[PDB]
Structure formats: C-alpha cells, structure tokens
Design a protein around this ligand. Sequence first.
Ligand SMILES: C=C(C)[C@H]1C/C=C(\C)CC/C=C(\C)CC1
Ligand SMILES: [Mg+2]
Ligand SMILES: [Mg+2]
Ligand SMILES: [Mg+2]
Length: 536
Amino acid sequence: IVRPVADFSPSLWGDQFLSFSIKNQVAEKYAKEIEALKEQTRNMLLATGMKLADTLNLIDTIERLGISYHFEKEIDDILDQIYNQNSNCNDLCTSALQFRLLRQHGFNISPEIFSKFQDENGKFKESLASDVLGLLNLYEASHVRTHADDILEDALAFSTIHLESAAPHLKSPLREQVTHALEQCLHKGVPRVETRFFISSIYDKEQSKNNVLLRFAKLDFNLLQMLHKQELAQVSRWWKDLDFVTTLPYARDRVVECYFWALGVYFEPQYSQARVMLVKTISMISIVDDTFDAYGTVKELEAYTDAIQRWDINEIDRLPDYMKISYKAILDLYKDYEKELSSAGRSHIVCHAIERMKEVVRNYNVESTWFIEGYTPPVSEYLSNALATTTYYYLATTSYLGMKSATEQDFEWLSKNPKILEASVIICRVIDDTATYEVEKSRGQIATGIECCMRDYGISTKEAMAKFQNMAETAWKDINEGLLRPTPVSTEFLTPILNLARIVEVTYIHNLDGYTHPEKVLKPHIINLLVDSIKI
Ligand SMILES: C=C(C)[C@H]1C/C=C(\C)CC/C=C(\C)CC1
Ligand SMILES: [Mg+2]
Ligand SMILES: [Mg+2]
Ligand SMILES: [Mg+2]
C-alpha cells in the first residue's frame, strides 16, 4: 500500500547559508557612521520652511531608500501637519504623492484633491498625458484606493497607457523606474525588495541624488543584511538538525524561501526574534501540508488531524512512524516558543497560534476528504474551508509572538477575524487558485477553487479567473481601508497583515507558483536580499 511519487525540485541553495560569521569590525564601523548619517537626515526632515513638494519628495525618498523606520515620529508629525492644513493648490505630481503618502500612513485625505485634474465626467484630462512625473505618481497612488475612492476608478488605466507610451524615450534612470513601476507598483511590493531595486538601480544613478541619503541607505541595507544572514544561518542550522530532508523526503525543502517570507513580513532589527519564530512556523506547516497533499493516506490523515486537536505527546503511538517525526517536532517547537517568551512573562500567548494551527489542520483534512470523494462544493462552502488552508490566519497570529509589544487585547482582536486579516487571506487564496489551477487540475483535484467557481456559476475558466481577480481587487480596497485612522489596534500590528498580502502578489507575479518553483521568482530576490551586498 505504498505512496505517491516525488516531483518536487530540491533546495537550490545547498548549505551556502549554513554558517555566517559577521565581520565584527565592519559592523561597528558601519553602525558608527550610520549614527552620524542618521542625525544629518533627521535635521533634513526637521528643516523649517520647506515647500510642500520638497517635503513630500524628501519623505518619499527616505521611505523608498528603506531608512524611514529610523524616523517614524518625524515623518508622522510632518504628514499629520500636511493632512490638517488641507493644501489643495498643487500640480498632479505633488497631489498624487500627497494622497499616496497620507493614505499609506492612515490619514483619510479626501480623493477630491483629484477633481481639478478631471473633466465633467470624472475622467482624467488627457492634456496631462505629457506629464510623466505626474502620471507616475498618479499610477502609484491608484493602488491605494478604498471603496470610497471611485473618483480614482480611471487613474490606473489612464496613467498606465500613457506611461507605456512615454517609457521608451525617457532618460535614465527615470525610464527604468517607470518600466519597473508598470511591472510592480510600490504599494503592493515587498519593502526590502523595492528598497534594494530603488537604492541600486535608481537612486544610485540619479544625477540629483543626495549623497548623504544614498550612503546612509547603502550602509543601513548592508548592515541589516548581516543580521538577516545570521538569522538565516541560525534557522538553517535548526532545519538541518531536524533532518526532514532525508527522514521526510516527500516534503518540499524550502527553508530559505520560508525565511524570505518572514523577512517580507518585517525586516527591522527589533523584530529579529519575531522573524526567527515565524520562519520556523512557516517551515513546519509546509511539512504538514505536503503530508496531506502528497503522501498520507486518508486513514493516516485522520489520526494526524485528531492527534493535533488533542495536542498531547501521549498521542504519538496512534500515528505511523513517519508522522511521529513531524508531530513531535511540532509539539517541541511550541515548547521552545514558550521557553523563549518566559523571561518576558509572555509564554501564555503561544496558545493563540496553537489554536490557529489546529484550525488549519482540520481544514487540510476536510480538503483531503473532498478530493477522495470527488466533491465540488459551492464557492461559499469552498471558501469556508479553503480560506484557513492559506495558513494566513495562522501566520498572522504567529507574526505577533515575537513582537514584544503585542498584548492579549491584540490577539483578541485578531482572533475575531477582523476585515483587514480576512482580505489578506482572500488575496492569498484567490491568487493561489488562479496561478495553480492548471497543475492541480491535471493531478485530479476536482475541488479546486476555479473549478468550484466554474460549476457553481456556470461560467468558463476565463470568466472564473476574472471573478477571482476581482475578489482580489475588492480585498485590496478593504486592506487599504483597514489602515485608515482610527485603527483598531496599533499600526505596528496591521503592517504584518498588509505585508502578508504583498508577499502573495510578489511570489505569484505573472501567475506562477514561485514558492513551489522558486527559481523563477524567488531566487533573484533571495540573491539580492541575502547573498549580494550593495556595492558602496
Ligand atoms: C496558499 C499559499 C500561498 C501558501 C502555500 C504554501 C504552504 C501551505 C507551505 C507553507 C505556507 C506558505 C509558504 C504560505 C503560502
Ligand atoms: Mg496543500
Ligand atoms: Mg501542498
Ligand atoms: Mg493551490
């Protein structure tokens, strides 16, 4: 009664990440210079009597350079001031940038700021088609819409067609920046990824660049990268001493991709413990998913699911030997988390992630039951099960474990499935179903999202993929709305959820599974963030 056949590609990284020894004198030299550069930058920000457009461009540059996390208080104070002054007297470039920066920071600036750029019908004035910097900022702003912003319904299409038309004749690096924006907008990109591109491909090549900011940005990126590499080494060593590579050979060996995921959720040094905890969880639920999907028999998956609900080491012997391996590793991981959080008296919060894991596994087992039965549920029923199998309710909960400022009330909010979390989960689900529809269908999975959608509504695969694309668009508007003040918890606890949605977009770009097939999408990102330093 043997098993399915292995068709997963092995880790393409080998052991190149296993040991990283930080050049300590370089670290100290970088940090010492950064302190000086950080103060110079702080004073640029606090400079009295700057014009609106100059201020917004400064803040935008500091944000794209990846160093704004040093200046949360200064940037906030400035945007707040701009928000409350109501300055509606500018051109498209400044207005669109004003709108984007304020919305991204939760300031509900009215979309009426764009009325002066439109005709009697709410269509942008085509006379603006020759203003490339205006179009570019309009373009970026168009991705931050909520449901109250139908004034902007035309902004994406308008700016896109005219940027495409202008791009081939633009000077550099402007051309490269426009071309990049059309493939990957800023708001929906992974921050370290956009930062790496901006620093190296754009700002470094700008004639007008500020030398202080550029040097700051390069040193800071390379210094954080040393931390990230230590973290990945520590995590690679943990994964190695688990040895699932050989004892659980049916499973995807993707701990580096998992680290990239955790790095997407937060890159700052204060979230180091959080990242390390998170990547371990992603790594481990990856193992569980492959057990349900590519190895376990329905009888085996039943006992596994029940063992997880009971969550007791007593239960191991009801499981086949190969499931004993992962089950003990799972239980041990949570005992590790409890020990890690003990000194800060935050051990009790681990139970929130545990309950969310039980939920994921219940729904894995349902999904397997559906496959065995040849069942094509209605879309509503399909989603009631398949949203949790994204693991995103679970990963979001997990992202909070290592965040020292997360309180019980923050977990209570998250446990009620707030709308911002639900939208992030929906984006993951529908993008995944759109990308992986064809392959899963060939493997016989009749319970696949798009199939459900086709059979339920009586519509073609094309119309179904388009209906899913639209649920993703609706979900982004809900994310954007969920960031607006007053927020139900600190922005600190919203950003991970937003970042989870961004990682989806980036991994499944151009409709391909970038996690199962890392070489396409993830590999260049991993090399740019974790292998190659920015040349100084
Ligand atoms: C649905 C998505 C995008 C998941 C699929 C991947 C797994 C279940 C393995 C670990 C979980 C990850 C990488 C989140 C993505
Ligand atoms: Mg699966
Ligand atoms: Mg799977
Ligand atoms: Mg899938």
